């Protein structure tokens, strides 16, 4: 039941994204631009394939996956990872693994907003997205 996550979403709040990016070794200049960028995230399904686009003035990504099936991914910061996305407690949980490290990207719906929690190391970033009509 991924249905309430589908659609077009725009970033409206960000907490601790610089901490998260620093933890991943992202360079200062990229952090700097990223801290002023407001992406649009588009989540689409076709049968049990989901496609998740992240669009911005800086970087752009797109992944397609089946829930519960591992896929290769190259992240916006150029990490080559092994990924899996699953529903867990009604949350869309994306786990990335590379070099023995793990990142998680957890999405949930609260009061119609999509809350993305990004964790690497001890860093925890919370980004809030709201629907675009
Ligand atoms: C879409 C522009 C983001 C720019 C950040 C690039 C360097 C850090 C990337 C970290 C992993 C992906 C973070 C996604 C954040 C989000 O979807 O809001």
Which technique was the structure solved with, according to the deposited record? X-ray
- 8 Å CB contact between 12 and 4: no
What is the CATH number that goes with domain 7-131? 2.40.128.20
C-alpha torsion sign, points 18, 22, 23, 27: positive
HEC assignment per residue over 85-111 = EEEECCEEEEEEEECCEEEEEEEEEEC
Give the integer Cα–Cα distance in Å for 107 and 85. Answer: 10
Name the DSSP letter for residue 121: T
Which residue, by CA, sits nearest to atom 5 of ligand 1?
A: 34
Q: How far from the centroid of its chain's Cα atoms is residue 98's Cα?
A: 16
- 8 Å CB contact between 118 and 127: yes
CA 86–ligand 1 middle distance (angstroms): 20
| Residue count of the chain | 133
Task: Verify whether ligand 1 is closer than 6 Å to residue 105 (CB atom).
Answer: no
Structure tokens at 96: 């990335």
Tell me, in Å, the resolution of the deposited structure.
1.0
Please name which of 31, 41, 43, 38 lies closest in space to residue 12, comparing C-alpha atoms: 38
Name the DSSP letter for residue 65: E
Please name which of 109, 108, 110 lies closest in space to residue 118, comparing C-alpha atoms: 108
């Amino acid at each position: 039941m991924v249905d309430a996550f589908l659609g077009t979403w725009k970033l409206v709040d960000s907490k601790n994204f610089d901490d998260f990016m620093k933890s991943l070794g992202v360079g200062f200049a990229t952090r700097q631009v990223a801290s002023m960028t407001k992406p649009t995230t588009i989540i689409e399904k076709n049968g049990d394939i989901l496609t998740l686009k992240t669009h911005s003035t800086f970087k752009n990504t797109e992944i397609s996956f089946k829930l519960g099936v591992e896929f290769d991914e190259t992240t916006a910061d150029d990490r080559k990872v092994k990924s899996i996305v699953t529903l867990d407690g009604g949350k869309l949980v994306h786990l990335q693994k590379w070099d023995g490290q793990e990142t998680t990207l957890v999405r949930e719906l609260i009061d119609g907003k999509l809350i993305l929690t990004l964790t690497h190391g001890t860093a925890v970033c919370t980004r809030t997205y709201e629907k675009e009509a």
